[PDB]
Amino acid sequence: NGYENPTYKFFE
Amino acid sequence: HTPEALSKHFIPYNAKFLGSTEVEQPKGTEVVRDAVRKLKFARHIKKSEGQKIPKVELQISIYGVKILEPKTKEVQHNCQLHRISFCADDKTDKRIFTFICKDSESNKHLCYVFDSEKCAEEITLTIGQAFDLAYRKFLESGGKDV
Numbered sequence A: 001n002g003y004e005n006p007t008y009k010f011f012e
Numbered sequence B: 001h002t003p004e005a006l007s008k009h010f011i012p013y014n015a016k017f018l019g020s021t022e023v024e025q026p027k028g029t030e031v032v033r034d035a036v037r038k039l040k041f042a043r044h045i046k047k048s049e050g051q052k053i054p055k056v057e058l059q060i061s062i063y064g065v066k067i068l069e070p071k072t073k074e075v076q077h078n079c080q081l082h083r084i085s086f087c088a089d090d091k092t093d094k095r096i097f098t099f100i101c102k103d104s105e106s107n108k109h110l111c112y113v114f115d116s117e118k119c120a121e122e123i124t125l126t127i128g129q130a131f132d133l134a135y136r137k138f139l140e141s142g143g144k145d146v
Helices: B003-008 B029-048 B120-140
Strands: A002-004 B011-023 B055-061 B064-069 B074-080 B084-089 B096-102 B109-115
Touching: A002 B120, B003 B055, B003 B120, B011 B029, B011 B120, B029 B084, B029 B096, B029 B109, B055 B120, B084 B120, B096 B120, B109 B120
Parallel strands: none
Antiparallel strands: A002 B084, B011 B055, B011 B109, B055 B064, B064 B074, B084 B096, B096 B109
16 A cells, blocks of 8 residues: 655656 | 645654665655665664664655654654655555655655554555645646745
8 A cells, every 4th residue: 555646746 | 634734734643763765766566665675674783783763753744744853853854745756554564654755965766664553554644645635736726836
C-alpha cells in the first residue's frame, strides 16, 4: 500500500 | 482525518527514524524495499555499536512533512510536499513506512525510512490524503502557486 503524489511531476 | 486538519494545521505523529538513503527512482515497490533493507542493515550495525535510532516527531500537512527533534521541537528536515514523490507502508513489516523526497540540495532521490509501533499504516494514509488535497488545490489554481 503506497501513494504517488500527482503534484510532484509538475514541480520538477 | 478531516481536510481542515491537513489543510489548515498539521497531524503530529511520533516515530523512530532509521535514516534516509539515496535511491535511483521517485517510486516503486522494489525501490523502497531495497532502501528499507539497507537501512535495517545499517541500524543493526549501529545497535551493535550501542546506538539507539533517534526518535522524531512528524508533522504532516498539505505543505509537507516536517521532521522534528521531539524534545527541542527543532526542525531537522522540512520535506515540502511537492518534492515527495511516493509514500508506502511495508507489507512485510507493519511498523515500517517510507517516503521518497527529491532533495533540495542535490537533485537526488532520498528514501526516508521510519518505524511506528501503532501508526505506520495510518501515517502512510495521512500522507496519501495530503497528496490528494494538495493536488486538488493545485488543479483549482489552474496549475499555479508556490
